[PDB]
Write a protein that binds this ligand. Structure first.
Ligand SMILES: CCCCCCCCCCCCCCCCCC(=O)OC[C@H](COP(=O)([O-])OCC(O)COP(=O)([O-])OC[C@@H](COC(=O)CCCCCCCCCCCCCCCCC)OC(=O)CCCCCCCCCCCCCCCCC)OC(=O)CCCCCCCCCCCCCCCCC
Ligand code: BCL
Ligand SMILES: COC1=C(OC)C(=O)C(C/C=C(\C)CC/C=C(\C)CC/C=C(\C)CC/C=C(\C)CC/C=C(\C)CC/C=C(\C)CC/C=C(\C)CC/C=C(\C)CC/C=C(\C)CCC=C(C)C)=C(C)C1=O
Ligand SMILES: CCCCCCCCCCCCCCCCCC(=O)OC[C@H](COP(=O)([O-])OCC[N+](C)(C)C)OC(=O)CCCCCCCCCCCCCCCCC
Ligand SMILES: CCCCCCCCCCCCCCCCCC(=O)OC[C@H](COP(=O)([O-])OCC[N+](C)(C)C)OC(=O)CCCCCCCCCCCCCCCCC
Ligand SMILES: COC(C)(C)C/C=C/C(C)=C/C=C/C(C)=C/C=C/C(C)=C/C=C/C=C(C)/C=C/C=C(\C)CC/C=C(\C)CCC=C(C)C
Ligand SMILES: COC(C)(C)C/C=C/C(C)=C/C=C/C(C)=C/C=C/C(C)=C/C=C/C=C(C)/C=C/C=C(\C)CC/C=C(\C)CCC=C(C)C
Ligand SMILES: COC(C)(C)C/C=C/C(C)=C/C=C/C(C)=C/C=C/C(C)=C/C=C/C=C(C)/C=C/C=C(\C)CC/C=C(\C)CCC=C(C)C
Ligand SMILES: COC(C)(C)C/C=C/C(C)=C/C=C/C(C)=C/C=C/C(C)=C/C=C/C=C(C)/C=C/C=C(\C)CC/C=C(\C)CCC=C(C)C
Ligand SMILES: COC(C)(C)C/C=C/C(C)=C/C=C/C(C)=C/C=C/C(C)=C/C=C\C=C(C)\C=C\C=C(/C)CC/C=C(\C)CCC=C(C)C
Ligand SMILES: COC(C)(C)C/C=C/C(C)=C/C=C/C(C)=C/C=C/C(C)=C/C=C\C=C(C)\C=C\C=C(\C)CC/C=C(\C)CCC=C(C)C
Ligand SMILES: COC(C)(C)C/C=C/C(C)=C/C=C/C(C)=C/C=C/C(C)=C\C=C\C=C(C)\C=C\C=C(/C)CC/C=C(\C)CCC=C(C)C
Ligand SMILES: [Fe+2]
Lengths: 281, 43, 51, 254, 53, 304, 45, 53, 44, 43, 53, 43, 53, 53
């Protein structure tokens, strides 16, 4: 089970809750208090989804959908056949995600490395929460949360968006899209560069970071560096998720009209409003 | 054996106090359950 | 005597941690709901996405 | 080619998605195999080769040709696993069964186990493309100065115990990347010791090193040379310092 | 059947007891929920009905 | 407790002008500026840059593309700078009319679009060759070029290939900020719902995976930067405890792990697959499938 | 049945007591909330 | 046939036991839910029917 | 002979005896509960 | 030949016990299947 | 035919055992589900109809 | 020749046992196929 | 033709065996699904219509 | 054509063989599928029409 170098690192310590208790491994996996808790929550949520689609009568995993309660039910707990199962699954998902992050914390402080990874995961956890907890609360009902189905939560996406015309015109949406695109670009380029240096042309010696900096300088005139590219991609992904959470928290709580009409304040600015010509004149 | 290091007698004493507290808790709970059943039966 | 109070303190400390966590979750949710009460009424009149 | 089914409902789009499933299976296989050029074959806690070695086979050896005459590195290779192998570890089994922790027997910081672990890298410095040493003291880096930010040089070093252990003296800088890697400390005991910059936070009046306490600053591994630091020494130093986040927590205050 | 005690020469008691406890609590919760999800076998609603409340 | 998000102390000396490994030192500039604002995050040295034939061609063609679009913008605004700054995001050099089919358009807007797209073609392919040659000169692999080729594949599918198969340049993308968003929306609407395209879903899977993976990887390196993790090329051949602790974190967390070389293959592939799958999906829309929801219904992931 | 005291030779009793307090508190809270979610068993109303 | 015990000179009993346990639990759960999804083999709805509830 | 755990036959037999005592008590309680529920609301 | 380090005697004993367990599992499953067949046949 | 035992000199027994186990379980599931999809080979609905339930 | 370190005899024994298992599997499958045919034939 | 044994001097028998097995299984499955698509070669429907069910 | 054998001094046989196999297989599959798309070169539908089924 152990890698050639894993033994010296398997020591006691790095636990937030429990000590000697739950400080062991199941194969490669480290299981602590929060490993136990996240296993419990994940298994319970999986079994709840399976029982829900059994009740519905659907076993094609591409048609399984556990839908939330209705908008009329409000914030109340609904019949388990009418949305209570979605609610329990959401509770279990939150618990499992949080326990996964805290397990990562334990593992990090056992290995002696920084806590950047659970911090980065917390952003995705918080976006999921914005979607299923907070935005429903400000809107007054859990019926505005997305369903647990492979192709039905896409219907939720589409309808939630087209409730505001084209959702492309949300500005935080724009920022999130730009950051996602740039994150993918930067990841492709980083992989390409590291591999081009480490696996060079046939018959040539291995390269260094000098060659990488030189390639990107000759190409575009700037190299951010080995540490800079990592800081940059991390922050890019985090800002993408942050601006997505922003685009959604304001969508039906502070904005209610089509998002394309927001931009018409720059068109209605009193000094170029009635000039004739262009699209808006 | 004693993975924890407790001797059989330490464990006996601790289990004695543990069962004491357990039976007390269970008695309180069954009393509360009788009260709730007189108020709101569920069977 | 000493062992009874020790174990009871351990159990009550666990219960207090649980209660703190519950208080925190409830404060978060309830405060979000209240802040939602400050929003315009169209925040409660949105059409359903049916899912 | 709309509504043009080769058989049944199978058109170019279904062909494409199934072809992609196949390509993706092959690609997962390739990636997981290429992720096996280190760490294998798998071992037991006794050090022996395990009955289970995985479901993807370890791939064929590739060769890395190194610059500066450093040679050729083959991955995977028994030579690479033997060179990077720690021997005579100071750990005791916590249990006869597998999957349980191994406890240090002495000072895990000095014995280099756990988060204080170090790998036996080559006792040779990391070089740049020209063949010079990558990390130098800034005195030996011709042209290098502090272009911005606070200069730590001369600042006292506060430890986890909130006690002071010395003053910063010199800066060890990555020359090709133009960044600080280690700052050297003049210990009040008359010794010089390196500490990574990533584990040191510059305040206005002090440099705070919360990883290790005042007791540990003395037993930090030293450099055989005062102008160069080897990969091995770097790994030992950084491991020692990091291990304090666990093994110096009882002393840590505030 | 007479030699099942050898499962403890195979598995460690600690991991086994952890796993078994988690498994049992999970299964019990699952069945209680499966019952509550049925308008029948929901002892709360069924009691509310039986007693005219 | 120092997270290494920002640099505390900047140091610098003479500029790193580069390495001679096959490069023509005459086509490389000699000017460099150091900017400290970038030093708090990355490197501060701005420059130098290589100026050759392919970069010259790409610069010329791309400047002409930009300028053609801007000239149409100025015409559409009536030469009024105020209407230009007012309607900047609403102005557009739109793809030809359908009446022209695939022939050279017989309109001003359409021929302007045609010539701007010609310049775009030239610039993008010249830049591809630039990447290839800038790697070949330093004796580096061509992974950057093969990654750029996937984005070029999608861009081509959008602008050149699919308009041809579908038989009209009106299917291509207009040159405007809001108009190309409208183009995406109308594309999804014309062909059922593009969500129910499987290759669209795959492109999205890999886009999301790119961010998942870089968050994981950058957080990992910053977590093991205290052990020298950012120096990856030296960890690949002379493994240190940084690589081991990263691998072990991820093994203990989710059971499997990568190497310091091997996670960059994941990175490269997640990058290129976004645009590969997207290009295939865009090709199949209109040419093989007119509605994606009905296709999903027939193929078992949409209810009937 | 008489030898159940050996469970303290397996698990540290301090951590077990704390975890048991947590478990029991959360279970009781969950049940109280289930009952409050029903008008007939809700006692505040 | 009389030499299947050799399968323990090949696989480790801990891994095999864990794998077979997970496999059996999941299989049982899936079959139970398959029957629960069919109202003809949902024994709960049955008991609801034959007893008039 | 073979012990991947360190427990011997004696230790394993004792541990097993206690394990089975607990198992049978658990099963007894569950059986009584099942009887009561079958009396109150049968499912077969 | 052994990849686990177990001798023929060890593995034979292990297999004897595994067989006992398997046959008990199968016996309970058979009885349950017979019951369910008498109660609600499927074939 | 007399020399097929050299597949064991070429292949590792453990990997192929696990592989063919996974393959056989998945093939069994695949065929069972193929049948279940066809109302004429669904033994559950067929039994339902055969007994009037 | 060998890629996995098995002699001729080791592999011959392994194959004997593997073929025993395979023919048992196949006999069971054949019995089940005959049964399903009698119950509901497909050809 | 009499020298076709020299492909094993160019190819690793292990890679070849694995790839061949995968290729053959997938091709078989593909052909079987092609036949299942066509109504006149779906043995499952042919037997149904033959035996009157 | 006397000296076409030098393409093996130029090219490596292993890469050539792998690529040639993949290429020929994909070509054959594509041609067969093109034929299946056409009702006249669909040998299955033609057999149905021929044998009265
Ligand atoms: C290493 C791994 C690599 C993986 C990738 C491999 C890549 C390399 C190449 C591989 C090539 C594979 C084959 C490609 C070509 C064939 C494509 C294909 O399968 O098309 C669907 C193919 C038919 O093609 P079509 O043209 O789409 O069908 C139109 C018919 O009119 C359909 O209508 P019909 O007249 O037949 O009847 C329709 C009806 C009848 O339904 C059926 O007959 C079957 C429907 C359910 C099929 C479920 C299959 C699930 C298999 C799972 C196996 C286990 C997992 C395996 C993978 C594990 C690892 C991930 O459908 C229903 O839903 C009826 C429900 C009951 C109503 C009462 O499906 C079938 O023939 C039935 C399902 C057979 C199993 C499919 C498994 C996938
Ligand atoms: C109403 C909107 C429709 C929709 C319609 C479309 C359409 C139409 C398309 C997609 C496409 C994509 N959509 Mg969308 N999309 C929808 C819903 C979503 C949702 C969501 C959560 O709702 C998500 C996450 C996505 C995600 C995505 C991406 C995964 C994908 C494009 C990848 C990419 O990098 O392209 C961006 C990358 C490029 C275009 C490559 C560019 C490369 C060239 C060479 C650049 C050269 C630069 C140039 C010369 C100028 C340089 C300037 C200077 C140098 C500075 N869409 C809905 C259903 N979407 C695209 C796709 O891949 O199709 C499947 C596409 O065409
Ligand atoms: C610096 O270099 C690096 C490495 O290498 C040194 C790496 O490896 C990695 C890691 C990255 C990769 C390997 C690349 C591929 C990864 C992805 C595409 C990310 C997506 C991930 C997955 C699909 C895997 C998901 C797996 C999960 C969630 C595990 C599922 C398991 C369980 C639910 C069981 C868990 C068991 C527990 C908790 C214990 C059981 C407890 C009981 C009581 C029973 C990175 C980032 C890296 O940067
Ligand atoms: C479907 C999407 C992935 C879901 C998760 C599946 C993996 C899992 O649960 O456990 C893997 C398990 C968990 O770890 P493990 O501990 O079993 O790893 C064992 C690894 N060996 C045997 C080689 C030592 O890992 C594996 O099976 C090993 C390889 C997994 C690689 C999976 C990569 C998937 C990436 C998909 C991206 C594209 C999406 C489109
Ligand atoms: C676990 C699989 C469970 C499948 C359950 C089932 O019967 O599903 C029916 C469905 C069959 O779909 P279907 O036939 O019901 O869909 C069309 C039916 N109409 C037209 C009526 C809507 O099975 C699947 O979808 C199987 C999907 C997985 C197949 C293997 C994929 C391998 C490649 C990687 C992914
Ligand atoms: C879609 O299709 C559906 C699902 C509807 C239908 C298809 C269903 C399918 C395909 C089902 C398949 C079922 C299978 C393959 C079932 C297999 C079951 C098996 C193999 C069960 C085996 C059980 C074994 C048990 C319970 C063994 C227990 C052993 C013990 C208790 C003792 C362990 C041994 C010890 C302690 C000895 C140790 C000795 C020493 C010296 C240390
Ligand atoms: C989806 O379909 C549904 C879910 C509806 C139906 C499915 C049902 C299923 C899948 C059911 C499965 C049931 C199973 C697998 C049940 C298993 C039950 C078992 C194995 C229970 C075991 C219980 C054991 C107990 C309670 C043990 C208690 C022990 C003690 C209280 C003390 C023991 C003392 C010890 C170990 C100290 C000794 C230590 C030393 C050092 C000597
Ligand atoms: C659209 O296309 C459709 C599907 C409609 C129509 C079909 C199209 C196409 C393109 C079909 C193509 C079919 C092809 C190319 C089929 C080729 C099949 C072949 C070449 C099959 C070969 C099978 C060989 C087997 C099963 C060999 C088995 C050998 C053994 C078990 C023994 C191997 C040696 C051993 C065990 C000893 C090794 C010795 C030592 C010392 C290690
Ligand atoms: C869509 O198309 C459909 C699915 C409808 C139709 C297509 C179906 C297809 C393509 C089906 C293909 C089926 C195939 C290829 C089936 C192959 C089955 C085989 C090869 C089964 C083999 C089974 C072997 C077994 C069960 C062996 C068991 C062995 C043992 C229990 C003992 C193991 C041996 C030992 C331990 C060796 C002794 C060890 C030492 C060290 C001396
Ligand atoms: C102040 O104003 C001045 C004049 C100073 C400068 C200002 C300029 C301005 C305001 C420029 C604005 C530019 C904008 C807004 C550009 C936006 C472009 C966007 C958003 C483009 C999006 C997608 C474009 C794609 C996918 C294009 C693909 C094109 C191709 C694949 C080209 C293929 C070739 C074609 C169609 C035919 C030509 C080929 C031949 C062989 C003749
Ligand atoms: C009225 O008139 C009549 C009756 C005559 C009309 C009837 C016509 C009929 C019935 C026509 C039927 C035609 C058919 C059924 C043709 C069948 C062809 C067959 C059965 C071919 C058999 C085998 C083909 C093989 C094995 C092809 C192998 C090809 C390869 C490329 C394999 C070697 C290379 C590999 C595997 C890739 C790697 C390459 C290297 C060099 C290592
Ligand atoms: C979701 O499904 C619902 C919730 C609706 C239904 C499901 C309910 C479930 C699954 C319930 C499960 C309940 C369980 C597993 C309960 C277990 C309870 C136990 C084992 C309680 C033990 C308590 C022991 C205590 C409190 C011991 C305390 C001991 C001391 C404080 C020592 C000091 C004692 C003194 C001083 C006594 C002096 C007289
Ligand atoms: Fe990297």
């Amino acid at each position: 089970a152990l890698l050639s170098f894993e033994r010296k690192y398997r020591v006691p310590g790095g636990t937030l809750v429990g000590g000697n208790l739950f400080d062991f491994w199941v194969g490669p996996f480290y299981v602590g208090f929060f490993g136990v808790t996240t296993f419990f929550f994940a298994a319970l949520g999986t079994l709840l989804i399976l029982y829900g689609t059994a009740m519905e009568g659907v076993w094609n995993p591409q048609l399984i959908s556990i839908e939330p309660p209705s908008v009329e039910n409000g914030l109340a707990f609904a019949p388990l056949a009418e949305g209570g199962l979605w609610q329990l699954i959401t509770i279990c998902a939150l618990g499992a995600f949080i326990s996964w992050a805290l397990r990562e914390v334990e593992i990090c402080r056992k290995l002696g490395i920084g806590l950047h990874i659970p911090f980065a995961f917390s952003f995705a956890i918080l976006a999921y929460a914005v979607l299923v907890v907070f935005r429903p609360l400000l809107m007054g009902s859990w019926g505005y949360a997305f369903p647990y189905g492979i192709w039905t939560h896409l219907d939720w996406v589409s309808n939630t968006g087209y409730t505001y015309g084209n959702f492309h015109y949300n500005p935080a949406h724009m920022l999130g899209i730009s950051f996602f695109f740039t994150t993918a670009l930067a990841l492709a380029l980083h992989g390409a560069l590291v591999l081009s240096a480490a696996n060079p042309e046939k018959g040539q010696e291995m390269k260094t970071a000098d060659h990488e900096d030189t390639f990107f300088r000759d190409l575009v005139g700037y190299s951010i560096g080995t540490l800079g590219i990592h800081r940059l991609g991390l922050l890019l992904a985090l800002m993408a998720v942050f601006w997505s959470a922003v685009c959604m928290i304001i969508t039906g709580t502070i904005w209610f009209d089509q998002w394309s009409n927001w931009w018409y304040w720059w068109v209605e600015l009193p000094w170029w409003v009635d000039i004739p010509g262009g699209v808006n004149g | 054996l004693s993975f924890t290091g407790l001797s059989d007698e330490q464990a006996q004493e601790l289990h004695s106090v543990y069962m004491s507290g357990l039976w007390l808790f269970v008695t309180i709970a069954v009393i509360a359950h009788i009260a709730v059943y007189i108020w709101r039966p569920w069977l | 005597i000493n062992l009874r109070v020790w174990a009871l303190g351990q159990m009550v400390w666990g219960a207090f941690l649980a209660a703190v966590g519950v208080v925190v979750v409830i404060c978060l949710l309830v405060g979000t709901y209240l802040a939602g009460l400050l929003l315009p009424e169209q925040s409660k009149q949105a059409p359903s996405p049916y899912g | 080619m709309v509504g043009v089914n080769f058989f049944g409902d199978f058109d170019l789009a279904s062909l494409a998605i199934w072809s992609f499933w196949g390509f993706l299976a092959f690609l997962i296989y390739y990636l997981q195999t290429e992720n096996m050029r280190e760490g294998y074959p798998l071992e037991m806690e006794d050090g022996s080769v395990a009955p289970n070695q995985g479901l993807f086979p370890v791939p064929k050896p590739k060769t890395f040709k190194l610059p500066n005459g450093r040679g050729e590195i083959v991955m995977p290779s028994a030579e690479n696993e033997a060179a990077h192998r720690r021997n005579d570890l100071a750990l005791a089994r916590t249990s006869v069964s597998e999957g349980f922790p191994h406890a240090p027997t002495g000072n895990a910081l000095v014995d280099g186990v756990g988060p204080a672990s170090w790998v036996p890298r080559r006792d040779e410095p990391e070089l740049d493309a020209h063949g010079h040493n990558k990390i130098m003291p800034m005195a030996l880096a011709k042209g290098f100065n502090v272009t911005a930010g606070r200069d730590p040089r001369g600042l006292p070093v506060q430890a986890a115990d909130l006690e002071v252990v010395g003053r910063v003296s010199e800066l060890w800088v990555d020359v090709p990347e133009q960044m600080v890697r280690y700052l050297e400390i003049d210990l009040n005991s008359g010794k010089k010791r390196l500490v990574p910059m990533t584990l040191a936070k510059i305040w206005a009046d002090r440099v705070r090193v919360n990883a290790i306490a005042s007791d540990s600053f003395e037993n930090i591994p030293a450099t055989r040379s005062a102008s160069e630091v080897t990969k091995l020494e770097e790994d030992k130093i950084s491991g020692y310092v990091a291990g304090g986040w666990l093994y110096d927590a009882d002393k840590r205050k505030r | 059947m007479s030699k099942f005690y050898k499962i403890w020469q195979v598995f460690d008691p600690r991991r086994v007891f952890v796993a078994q406890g988690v498994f049992l609590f999970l299964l019990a919760v699952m069945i209680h929920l499966i019952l509550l999800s049925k308008p029948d076998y929901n002892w709360l609603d069924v009691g509310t009905a039986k007693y005219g409340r | 407790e120092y997270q290494n998000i920002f640099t505390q102390v900047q140091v610098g000396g003479a500029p790193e002008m580069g390495l001679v490994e096959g490069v023509d030192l005459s086509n490389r500039t000699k000017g460099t500026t150091n900017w400290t604002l970038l030093g708090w995050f990355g490197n501060a040295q701005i420059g130098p840059i290589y100026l050759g034939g392919w970069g010259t061609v790409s610069l010329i063609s791309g400047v002409l593309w930009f300028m053609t679009i801007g000239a149409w913008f100025w015409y559409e605004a009536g030469f009024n700078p105020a209407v230009f700054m007012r309607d900047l995001f609403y102005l557009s050099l739109d793809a030809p009319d359908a009446k022209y089919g695939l022939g050279v358009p017989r309109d001003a807007e359409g021929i302007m679009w045609f010539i701007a797209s010609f310049f775009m073609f030239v610039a993008v392919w010249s830049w591809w060759i630039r990447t290839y040659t800038r790697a070949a000169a330093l004796g580096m692999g061509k992974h950057t070029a093969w990654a750029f080729l996937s984005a070029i594949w999608l861009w081509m599918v959008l602008g050149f290939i699919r308009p041809i198969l579908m038989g009209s340049w009106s299917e291509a993308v207009p040159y405007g900020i809001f108009t190309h968003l409208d183009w995406t929306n109308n594309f999804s609407l014309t062909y059922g719902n593009l969500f129910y395209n499987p290759f669209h879903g795959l492109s999205i899977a890999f886009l999301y995976g790119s961010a998942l993976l870089f968050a994981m990887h950058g957080a990992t390196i910053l977590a093991v930067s205290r052990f020298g993790g950012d120096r990856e090329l030296e960890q690949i051949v002379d493994r240190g405890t940084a690589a081991e602790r990263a691998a072990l974190f991820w093994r203990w967390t989710m059971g499997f792990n990568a190497t310091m070389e091997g996670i960059h293959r994941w990175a490269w592939w997640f990058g290129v697959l976004v645009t590969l799958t997207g290009g295939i999906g865009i090709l199949l829309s209109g040419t093989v499938v007119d509605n994606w929801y009905v296709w999903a219904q027939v193929h078992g992931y949409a209810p009937v």
